[PDB]
Amino acid sequence: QGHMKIGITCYPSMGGSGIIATELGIKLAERGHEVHFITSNIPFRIRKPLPNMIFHQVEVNQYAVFQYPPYDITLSTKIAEVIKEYDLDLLHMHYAVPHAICGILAREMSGKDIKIMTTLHGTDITVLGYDHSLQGAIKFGIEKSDIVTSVSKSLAQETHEIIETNKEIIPIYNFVRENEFPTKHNTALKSQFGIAPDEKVLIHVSNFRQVKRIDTIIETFAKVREKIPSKLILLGDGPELVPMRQLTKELNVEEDVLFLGKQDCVSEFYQLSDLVLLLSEKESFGLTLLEAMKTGVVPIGSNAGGIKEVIKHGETGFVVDVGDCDSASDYAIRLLEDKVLYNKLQKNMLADIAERFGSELITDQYEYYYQKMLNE
């Protein structure tokens, strides 16, 4: 037990997973562990440099000989070079593919029997939904990792179902860094963005993929809007943006839906919101829910995946069946009309997420299993 030398690999900019992996490394470095990120040359935005937190980055070039940019090999070579230069104790890889495989290859290249934790975020299920070429790679990356974790219990279950492995998968929930998301409401920025100070605000934040079911979110909002003057803020960009814009026209809510594009400072938008919606068809955890909940925003989610673990239906928010804009709008109208209900769920919610998703508690759990695999 004690100080560890840790190599972390993730996609630092790809959604929730990259945020989680980065914030976890920062928490570990603030405790005094020696933390090495090894990623491709993708930006990070670290605010305070630490001498014990080093970001190693690799360029993936094509050369005229490779048919494809050799990400897996270039990354594995860089991980192995950090293992040798800094005598790393363990690797923490995010995603079975490509990153568990990269860590396994880097272990071979380094000649050191380093321990490997792999954390599953749900992308390995997504890949297999498109085609089964990688079925054997995902099974191998899971089974040759020393410890495997998943960001929800639902994801651990789904993994066993789809991958067909006896490998133990440890559910360890996601978290937000509490000082990045102060619990507070602020109406100062509302006018800037064309929202009247009193107006109710519903927010959704995502990559605008079809799996997010923004169609259900806009349909929900249209039903809300005819009872309650309100705005729907949609943060992000992606494949469904134009079809969703068109949907707001067909439902006659175009002037009330704000497509604000990608935003780095999401905290300030949660601070002006009244409800957060994540009605996804598939979702291992749902980090935007937790970011909003920590801010104090009461959530409505679907019952897909881990969302029903994040939200306690009827206690800290509401959960609806996938695609049920009737029930979602019913709950939203009640929450926007009923301050007693809103205050009660919000109070329950703030206590619950402190209890189950606090950054200190989750970091302790990862740290515990780092040490467990180092002692096996």
Residue whose CB is less far from ligand UDP, 7 or 122: 122
Instruction: Select from 345, 337, 341 the least CA-distant residue to 227.
Output: 337
Strand partners, 233: 203, 258
Cβ-in-10-Å burial (0-12, 13-18, 19+) of 61 comes to exposed
287: annotated binding-site residue? yes
Distance CA 77, CA 103 (A): 10
Q: Got the DSSP string for 101-147?
A: HHHHHHHHHHTS--EEEEEE-SHHHHHHHH-GGGHHHHHHHHHHSSE
Told to check if 17 binds ligand UDP by CB under 6 A, we report yes
Told to check if 74 binds a copy of itself by CB under 8 A, we report yes
Distance CA 20, CA 121 (A): 10
Site string for ligand UDP, 186-205 (x = CB under 6 A): -------------------x
Told to check if 40 binds ligand UDP by CB under 6 A, we report no
Told to check if 54 binds a copy of itself by CB under 8 A, we report no
Is 306 within 8 Å of 284 (Cβ atoms)? yes
How many other CB atoms sit within 10 Å of the CB of residue 199? 16
Told to check if 301 binds ligand UDP by CB under 6 A, we report no
Q: What 3-state DSSP class applies to 170? A: strand
Which residue in the set 116, 151, 235, 298 belongs to the binding site for ligand UDP (CB under 6 A)? 235
- Smallest distance from a copy of itself to CB 360, Å: 30
Which residue in the set 263, 348, 365, 371 belongs to the binding site for ligand UDP (CB under 6 A)? 263
Which of ligand UDP, a copy of itself, none sits in contact with 169, Cβ below 5 to 8 A by type? none
Which of ligand UDP, a copy of itself, none sits in contact with 288, Cβ below 5 to 8 A by type? ligand UDP
375: annotated binding-site residue? no
For ligand UDP, the binding residues (CB under 6 A) are: 15-17, 19, 205-207, 235-236, 262-264, 266, 287-288, 291
